[PDB]
Each structure stands twice: as C-alpha cells, then as structure tokens.
C-alpha cells in the first residue's frame, strides 16, 4: 500500500520538525532578504566578527583574538559546540526512526557513529548559499569568503562543503523530503563493524520505498530526482573523508585545540 | 514509452555482449557454478604461478624467480596490460550508447577517462567470487589467499576490491542489467572539467529511467534493488580513490630505468 508509505513519510517529517529548531523553511525564509520580520547580522571580517558578539550570543572572545584564541580558534572552538548541537538533535531524530531503537544497542551505536556527520552536511546545505551560511540559529551569517581566508590549517574546512551545497541545494529539497533522506543515511548497514545486517536493511527498503513514493508526489516534473538524490549519498561521504584529514592535521599544528569528547569518540582513522 | 526505454535496454545489451569476451553468465559457469568441460588453471602458491606464467596463453613476462625480478611486481604490471585492454573494449562500448558519440570531442574523452576505473572494478565483480578472481580471458584462477601473500606493498592491493566484489554481487545482477548500469556510470554529469554537462544528464536521466524498468522486470521480487546499486556507485568511488592511494606508494618503490620509456608509456595513469 501506498496510504502506508505517506504515513510513515509524515511521521519522520513530524520528528523532523520537532527535533531541528532550524529547519530549511526558516533557514531559506531568513536567507531571502525579504522576509525582513528578522534579518541576520553579516561576518565578512575581523571587525564584524568584533561587532558579532555585540548584537548576538557569544561566550567567546570580542576584543582582540591574536594572543587569545585568534578568530580561526574562536570561530571553530565554536563550531565544535554546534557540531555535537547537531549529534545529540539527530541522535535524538534517530530514536523516532520506526525500528530504530529495536537494533541491537551496538548496532544503534554504530550508524550513529558513521551517519552522524553525513546528516549534519546534508542538513548543513539548508543553512548555505553560494555566499555564506547561517551561524547562531539563523541569528548570524558568516561570508564564505570570510571562511576561507582563515589561516591555512583552518582557511579550507569550510570550502569543500560550500560546493557540496550549491549543487545540493540544485535539487531544491524540503524538509519533509530531507526527513526521509537523513532516515535512509542512517539506516544504511554497510557501516563498519554491523552486527545483523538484515534487520537494518528491511528498514532501509521501507524508509527507500517512502523517500521515493514522496520524491515522485512531491516533484511529479523532476526526472529521476530519486536517483539524482542517492547518487548525492557518494558526495557527502567523500566530504566526510577529507574532512577527518583536516582533522588529523590541525591536532600536529594546534597542540593546544581541543576536540569535544564526543565528536572524538564518533571519529577513527581509515 | 516502455517501447524505449526495453529497446535501449536490449541495444545495450547487444552491444556488451559484442564488445565483452568474458560475460557474467560465462565467467559464473566457469567459477563456483559447475558446467565441467575445460576447468581452469588455479594458482594459489608461487609455483603454481610460477608453472603457469608458462603453460599459459599470456604475453609479458616468463615465469622466473631466482633473484631476476620479483613475482609481486610481474603480477601487478599484469593487471595493467589487461586493464588497458579493458579500456580499449569499454571506450568501443561507450560508443554505442545512444547520444555519446554526438557529445563534445573533449567531453567523451573526459567521461571516459574517469568511467573507466568505476567500469573495470565493477566488470571485475563478475570474474571474481569469494575465494579468487578468474585471469586469462578465463583460462585461469588466481586465488584470493595468494594475492593476499603477495609482496608487502601488493598483498593489499586487491582485497578492497574482493570485498567490493563479494556485497556487490550479492545483487545478483546478470549482464542484461550491467549493460544499462555500465552506460549510466560513463554517463556521470559530475566528472570534473566536463564542458556541457546538459547533454550528459539528459542521456543518463535516460538510462536511469531504462535501469530502473529493466530491474522491475528483470528482479520483480528483489524490492528497491534500483536504489541499492545506485548506492554500490559510493563504494566504487571509494575504491577508485583507495586505489590511486596505494599506487602512489608503488610509484615509491619501483621507478627510475631506461628501459621502460616505451613500454611504461603505453601505461599513464588510467
Ligand atoms: O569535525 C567535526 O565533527 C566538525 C563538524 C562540523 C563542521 C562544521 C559545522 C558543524 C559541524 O567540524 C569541526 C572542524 C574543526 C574543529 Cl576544530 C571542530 C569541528
């Protein structure tokens, strides 16, 4: 039945809705400078970055940051904390997952660990445009060239992700599509280390099955948008990839950067 | 119209068979399926390889070892003469998929030059089964184990693929299927440096649309199965890069001689 894949279709976009206080909609709706009830306060360099603190929420440094955690360390010490924001509200998504919570607990534990980050750039795309992205919930907006002038070791973290998104946003996805999307990123079972392969991929078949039924109705005009969309899974993986040697290399230059635990406990080596 | 769509499949169809020596359908009477009428020639020690490089129907190196080249390196540049072989038959391929020759000059010749790893890892699936790879249009089988004994930078060089081999033909695809995913895989629109990505999307929309049918048809029970090969495309990729990586370090290891101008011309780095 059909009437049975649109019901779990607008379960996992209601846990959607109820766990990312920051959906697409908001995301797009604050990015289109028109819908003024609530404008973002740009970052485009250092003096804005001082002028940043003033009207939004930052625990971090406002004066000067050279001898004191310069703007790259500011900036990403404070990445970090969105970046675990981002684990636990999707750990959190992934508990409503229909037979989620039923895997064995090292199974749960496991695409957690590898679907965590594929989720966050995928999500991260409705906070971007080719300029910039939304930082401090839609409240700021960070330049992407401001970004990648950053010093060396922290200049191109960002970069790779921009591209990611113009091309991503192409697609011109909702979050009632996105909501099945991140549901079959996590569901996936040729994760590292699975325990019971086959109860993972019955999931998948059922969350693929709705993501598709939901891609036709929701876009009868865009031709093989399904496949367009699996297809995308490859990229964020790549990204994953270089991101973690960019990790690997900041830890030998910043002996002093510390990762959050639990962003280290997600990330491995090979 | 389902008209088409079954009469590219076909065409497709055709045009591997006439363009690939070794089918799936005859690879797998060959290996673990029995159709007992000329075994083939295993090799699973050194003198196994060693009394074969000999008995057997190949052109490069006579089997010798006593301090006058190393068996890993003799095996490895196998590999290359047979991979460009490959190349030479998907490029003859390629050609027969309806719109890729009236492409731009510069965009055939850059499809093809990143299709072709994706291609030739996936046909090797075919050769390949759990415990060795088919070499020698057939006539032999290089065991899994032994290549795994292979010298230290080349005993690693081809497991990722044995496992790549083994969760991809769980699938159970058959020829008539590879034909259309083969098409679509040189068909990518995301190749870099590609000039008019339009044309190449709109012939792929439309494979795409012809995989999909052909799987309906050909697999009516295996469910989702368009979604979980589109999904294989990752690993491939994942592969094709790890691949490169250990090739480099070979490129650390065996280099400066006069005598292979000529020959280690004909061999670039695809
Ligand atoms: O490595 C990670 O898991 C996060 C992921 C992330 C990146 C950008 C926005 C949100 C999360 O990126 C980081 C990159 C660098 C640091 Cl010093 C910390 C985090």
């Given at each position: 039945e059909s009437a049975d894949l649109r019901a779990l279709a607008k379960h996992l976009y209601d846990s959607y809705i109820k766990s990312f206080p920051l959906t697409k909609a908001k995301a797009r709706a604050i990015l289109t400078?028109?819908?003024?009830?609530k404008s973002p306060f740009v970052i485009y360099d250092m003096n804005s970055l001082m002028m940043g603190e003033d009207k939004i929420k930052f625990?971090?440094?406002?004066?000067?940051?050279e001898q004191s955690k310069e703007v790259a360390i500011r900036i990403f010490q404070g990445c970090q904390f969105r970046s675990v924001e981002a684990v636990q509200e999707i750990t959190e998504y992934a508990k409503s997952i229909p037979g989620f919570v039923n895997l064995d607990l090292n199974d749960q534990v496991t695409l957690l660990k590898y679907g965590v980050h594929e989720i966050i750039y995928t999500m991260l795309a409705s906070l971007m445009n080719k300029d910039g992205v939304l930082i401090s919930e839609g409240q700021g907006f960070m330049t992407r060239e401001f970004l990648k002038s950053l010093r060396k070791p922290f200049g191109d973290f960002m970069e790779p992700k921009f591209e990611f998104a113009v091309k991503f946003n192409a697609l011109e996805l909702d979050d009632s599509d996105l909501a099945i999307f991140i549901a079959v990123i996590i569901l996936?079972?040729?994760?590292?280390?699975?325990?019971?392969v086959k109860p993972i991929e019955d999931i998948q078949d059922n969350l693929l099955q709705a993501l598709e039924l939901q891609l036709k109705l929701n876009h009868?005009?865009?031709?093989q948008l399904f496949a367009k969309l699996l297809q995308k899974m490859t990229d964020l993986r790549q990204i994953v990839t270089e991101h973690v040697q960019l990790l690997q290399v900041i830890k030998k230059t910043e002996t002093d950067m510390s990762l959050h635990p639990l962003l280290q406990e997600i990330y491995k080596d090979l």
């Open positions: 400078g028109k819908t003024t009830d625990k971090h440094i406002t004066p000067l940051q996936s079972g040729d994760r590292p280390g699975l325990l019971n009868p005009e865009s031709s």
